[PDB]
């Protein structure tokens, strides 16, 4: 099995397959879509940013649309499970700094991601093992004009495009997603790493609609101070800041990063850039 006259298809690794660039000799990741183009154009617009994967090829192969990406490593959800679903505070703070910057970069390129979750952040392999990458622009959306920075308008009655567990409250309410919502989702991700789960995780119903209402109801009835009880105040400050942003507001990314850098300092952690999964 060969795609693009250049890549040998290997075994399933996640429908994601390991592949081999036959000419260069390097391994790649291959995504197959049964007869992706839109997503490739967003990746291309994002290319050249820290933690943005490079796309090596995209085309047509039989009854499949194919995309080939540089090989990355396990996702943060994979590594969370590998660490028995608990991260040290230091690892959470190291991840927070990078993840805020990845989201800022996407926003600087005029898009919102709309599905921020642990499964969409992958660690690099090899010399890039300490670098957090962001993937999956299949739900991303342009929120402003590149030159004038004129914002898309406020709208309601929007379907939940994302993952319910990490969706912002405004997303549950059907409001058009904007920059604030990517960051609020990240806030839930960070408390998820701290807690091992979220209070609304695992709620079930007969149909998705009832399930989402269940999650929305619990999310709305859980104050930030209760969610973050027993953890450094910075996590609540982060979430409160994100919920205070208006639809069109430009987030103060530097302030949010400084929250966690300040806590990093007060905790006495060392500048050795070692994550938990490398030191079980």
Ligand X SMILES: COc1ccc(-c2cc(C(=O)Nc3cc(-c4c(-c5ccc(F)cc5)noc4C(C)C)ccn3)n3c2CN2C[C@@H](O)[C@@H](O)[C@@H]2C3)cc1
Active site residues: 115
Q: Closest Cα to residue 5, out of 61, 65, 81, 70?
A: 61
**Residue 31 in contact with ligand X, rule: CB under 6 A:** yes
Nearer to ligand X, 30 or 93 (CB): 30
**Residue 68 in contact with ligand X, rule: CB under 6 A:** yes
Instruction: Show the tokens assigned to 133.
Output: 């990458």
The answer on whether 15 is annotated among ligand-binding residues is: yes
Question: Residue 133 CB, nearest distance to ligand X (Å)?
Answer: 8
Coil/strand/helix, residue 266: helix
Question: Residue 53 CB, nearest distance to ligand X (Å)?
Answer: 6
Tell which positions 123-142 bind ligand X, by CB under 6 A: 135
CA distance 66 to 36: 8
Q: Closest Cα to residue 92, out of 121, 126, 52?
A: 121
Question: Residue 95 CB, nearest distance to ligand X (Å)?
Answer: 16
**Residue 76 in contact with ligand X, rule: CB under 6 A:** no
The answer on whether 16 is annotated among ligand-binding residues is: yes
**Residue 69 in contact with ligand X, rule: CB under 6 A:** yes
Q: Cα torsion for 204, 210, 216, 220, to the nearest 10°?
A: -100
Nearer to ligand X, 45 or 242 (CB): 45
Contacts of 122 (CB under 8 A, 6+ apart): 53, 72, 73, 74, 75, 76, 132, 133, 135
Give the interface size with ligand X as a residue count (CB under 6 A): 17
Tell which positions 159-188 bind ligand X, by CB under 6 A: none
Sign of the torsion formed by the C-alpha atoms of 262, 263, 264 and 267: positive
Identified binder of ligand X from the candidate list 49, 74, 124, 138, rule CB under 6 A = 74
Identified binder of ligand X from the candidate list 1, 2, 12, 13, rule CB under 6 A = 13
Distances from the Cα of 90 to the Cα of 93, 191, 199, 232, angstroms: 5, 13, 23, 12
CA distance 196 to 186: 15
**Residue 72 in contact with ligand X, rule: CB under 6 A:** yes
Pure H helices in 28-88: 37-46, 76-82
Could you tell me if 169 and 219 are in contact, meaning their C-beta atoms sit under 8 angstroms apart?
Answer: yes
**Residue 73 in contact with ligand X, rule: CB under 6 A:** yes
Identified binder of ligand X from the candidate list 1, 5, 12, 16, rule CB under 6 A = 16
Identified binder of ligand X from the candidate list 14, 48, 62, 174, rule CB under 6 A = 14
Identified binder of ligand X from the candidate list 67, 112, 256, 259, rule CB under 6 A = 67
The answer on whether 204 is annotated among ligand-binding residues is: no
- Residue with the closest Cβ to ligand X? 14
Helix-strand-coil percent breakdown of the chain, rounded to 5? 40, 20, 40
Question: Residue 211 CB, nearest distance to ligand X (Å)?
Answer: 23
Q: Which residues are annotated as a binding site for ATP?
A: 13-16, 31
Name the site residues for ligand X (rule: CB under 6 A): 13-14, 16, 29-31, 67-69, 71-75, 78, 122, 135
């Amino acid at each position: 099995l060969r795609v693009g006259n250049r890549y040998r298809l290997g075994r399933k690794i996640g429908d994601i397959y390991l592949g081999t660039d036959i000419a260069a000799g390097e391994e790649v990741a291959i995504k197959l879509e049964c007869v992706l183009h839109i997503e490739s154009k967003i990746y291309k617009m994002m290319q050249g940013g820290v933690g943005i994967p490079t796309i090596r090829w995209c085309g047509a192969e039989g009854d499949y649309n194919v995309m080939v990406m540089e090989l990355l490593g396990p996702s943060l959800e994979d590594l969370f499970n590998f660490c028995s679903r608990k991260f040290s505070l230091k690892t959470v703070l190291l991840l927070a700094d990078q993840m805020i910057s990845r989201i800022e970069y996407i926003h600087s390129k005029n898009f919102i991601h709309r599905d921020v979750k642990p499964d969409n952040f992958l660690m690099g392999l090899g010399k890039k093992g300490n670098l957090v990458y962001i993937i999956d622009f299949g739900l991303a959306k342009k929120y402003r004009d590149a030159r004038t920075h004129q914002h898309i308008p406020y709208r309601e009655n929007k379907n939940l495009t994302g993952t319910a567990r990490y969706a912002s409250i405004n997303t549950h309410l059907g409001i058009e997603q904007s920059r604030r919502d990517d960051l609020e989702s990240l806030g839930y991700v960070l408390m998820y790493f701290n807690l091992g789960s979220l209070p609304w995780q695992g709620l079930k119903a007969a149909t998705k609609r009832q399930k989402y209402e269940r999650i929305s109801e619990k999310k709305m009835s859980t104050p930030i101070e209760v969610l973050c009880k027993g953890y450094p105040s910075e996590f609540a400050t982060y979430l409160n800041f994100c919920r205070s942003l208006r639809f069109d507001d430009k987030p103060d990314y530097s302030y949010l990063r400084q929250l966690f850098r300040n806590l990093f300092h007060r905790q006495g952690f060392s500048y050795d850039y070692v994550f938990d999964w490398n030191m079980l």
